[PDB]
Amino acid sequence: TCPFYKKIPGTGFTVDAFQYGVVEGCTAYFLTHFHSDHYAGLSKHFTFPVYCSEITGNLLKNKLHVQEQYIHPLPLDTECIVNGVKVVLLDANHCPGAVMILFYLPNGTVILHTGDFRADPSMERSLLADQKVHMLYLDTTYCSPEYTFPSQQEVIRFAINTAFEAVTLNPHALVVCGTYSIGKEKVFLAIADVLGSKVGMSQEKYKTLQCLNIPEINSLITTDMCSSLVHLLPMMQINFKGLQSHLKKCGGKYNQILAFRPTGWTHSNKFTRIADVIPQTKGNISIYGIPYSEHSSYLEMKRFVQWLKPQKIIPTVNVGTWKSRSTMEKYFREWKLEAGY
Ligand code: NI
Numbered sequence: 001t002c003p004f005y006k007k008i009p010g011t012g013f014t015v016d017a018f019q020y021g022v023v024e025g026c027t028a029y030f031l032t033h034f035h036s037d038h039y040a041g042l043s044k045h046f047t048f049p050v051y052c053s054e055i056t057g058n059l060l061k062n063k064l065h066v067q068e069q070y071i072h073p074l075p076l077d078t079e080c081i082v083n084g085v086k087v088v089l090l091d092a093n094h095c096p097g098a099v100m101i102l103f104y105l106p107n108g109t110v111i112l113h114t115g116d117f118r119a120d121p122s123m124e125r126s127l128l129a130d131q132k133v134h135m136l137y138l139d140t141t142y143c144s145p146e147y148t149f150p151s152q153q154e155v156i157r158f159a160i161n162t163a164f165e166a167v168t169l170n171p172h173a174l175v176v177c178g179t180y181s182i183g184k185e186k187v188f189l190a191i192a193d194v195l196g197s198k199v200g201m202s203q204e205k206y207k208t209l210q211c212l213n214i215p216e217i218n219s220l221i222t223t224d225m226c227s228s229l230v231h232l233l234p235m236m237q238i239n240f241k242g243l244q245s246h247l248k249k250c251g252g253k254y255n256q257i258l259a260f261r262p263t264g265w266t267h268s269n270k271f272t273r274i275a276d277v278i279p280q281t282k283g284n285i286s287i288y289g290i291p292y293s294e295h296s297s298y299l300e301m302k303r304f305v306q307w308l309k310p311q312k313i314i315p316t317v318n319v320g321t322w323k324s325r326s327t328m329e330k331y332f333r334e335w336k337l338e339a340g341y
Contacts, residue, residue: 002026005137005314008113010105011085015113015137018042027083028072032115033098034059035181042066051082053089055097058211059182077127090126092117094294095183096212102127112308113137114316119296119304128308136310140317141295143328147265149293150274156190158274159260159290163191166258166286167229174254175230176246177262178238182208183294184262189220191260192230200228226253235261240282247285256284262292302335309341 006017012027018041023029031052032038042050044065049072052060057073060066074080076089076099086104094116103111112133163175175195177188192199199221201209206223214220222228233246238261247257258279269291279286296304305313313332318324 003319005316005319008103008111010107010109011103012083013085013103015101016115018046022048030101030113031056031060032092032101032113033095034063035095035116035183038116039064046070051087053097053099055211055213056099058213059097059208062211063208088127090123090128093120093123094118095181096185096214097182102133109134111135111137112310114139116141116294117296118294119300121303123304124307133308134311135314136305136308136312137314137316138301138305139295140301140315140319140328142265142293142298143301143315143318143331145298146270147298148269149265149291149297152186152292154274155290155292156186158277159187159288160190160194162288163230163258164194166256167195170256172254173229173256173258174247174250176238176243176257176259177230177232178235178259179205179232179262180235182212184292185209185212185214187260187262187290187292188230188232189214192220192228195229197229198222198227199230199232200225201232205232225250229254238287240285240287243285243287257286259285259287261287261289263289264293264295265291302331305332306335306339309339311341 002014002017002020002023006014012025013030014023014026015030016032016038017023017029018039029048029050031050034056042064046066047070050070051072051074054073057071060071061068074089076091080087088102089099092098092100092115098115100115100117101113110131110133114137116139167173175191188199203223206221209217209221225231238259243257243259247254279288315328
């Protein structure tokens with residue numbers, strides 16, 4: 001059955017709750033973003049109202065084939081009424097179309113559900129600043145002090161200078177970026193922009209990008225692999241074997257590969273700055289691991305919550321074991337004692 005952390009008290013609303021069949025009482029199913037963990041169970045066969053951003057609705061329509069009658073897209077930063085209750089969607093700074101949701105309950109309680117998010121100080125001057133938030137449903141993916149990472153901008157600058165150098169040294173090199181879902185598009189679009197190229201990719205991946213309301217998209221991407229010097233491949237192919245195999249496929253148009261694996265955190269975040277990073281190399285193929293995160297670091301999460309001062313926190317990630325829950329509760333009390341709420 002649907003867990004309490006996916007229900008919104010005193011409404012018949014749920015959030016990211018599609019894998020449990022019909023939820024008893026639920027009149028509106030919200031979807032924060034188009035990642036398979038959150039949408040799991042949604043298909044062309046679902047027949048209840050789904051509320052979501054415009055981007056998320058394009059994806060539901062075109063990738064999952066959910067029927068149009070059941071998709072209710074809502075604009076951002078706008079007060080809307082859903083089944084008699086006032087809501088607002090805000091940018092989550094996660095992947096394309098990902099939202100936080102603000103619910104104003106009839107009794108006067110205010111609830112923020114973050115979805116998946118990367119907390120940022122620009123969220124301190126949104127509609128959130130205008131009133132007290134009593135309850136916070138929080139993306140606790142990286143809720144432990146070991147989880148540090150560079151800014152997105154530091155990582156992109158590094159990727160740009162690295163790719164530009166390699167291709168100026170060898171104008172027959174190919175750049176490859178690994179991918180598995182939506183998100184982290186800036187990695188490949190920034191590399192392509194410094195090399196004066198479009199990004200080549202499969203038909204399924206191009207169809208996905210074409211749903212994302214990215215300005216000038218038709219000038220940036222193509223299905224003609226031949227004509228482009230940045231290619232996208234599935235993350236699973238980003239290894240020496242997969243990359244040599246792909247290089248054979250391209251018809252001796254390239255004689256070298258430089259590949260990027262955007263990942264979350266891995267244990268080498270604890271010593272290495274972005275400027276110290278060096279690739280793994282085997283022959284004419286080099287692979288760079290780059291920690292481009294679309295989740296809050298510990299410090300980013302802590303700052304956001306210390307600013308917001310919620311009366312209660314409801315974790316939404318890593319809630320499956322008592323040890324994880326206990327650990328997280330300890331950090332929430334620390335934050336509250338430091339900040340005086
Ligand atoms: Ni996500």
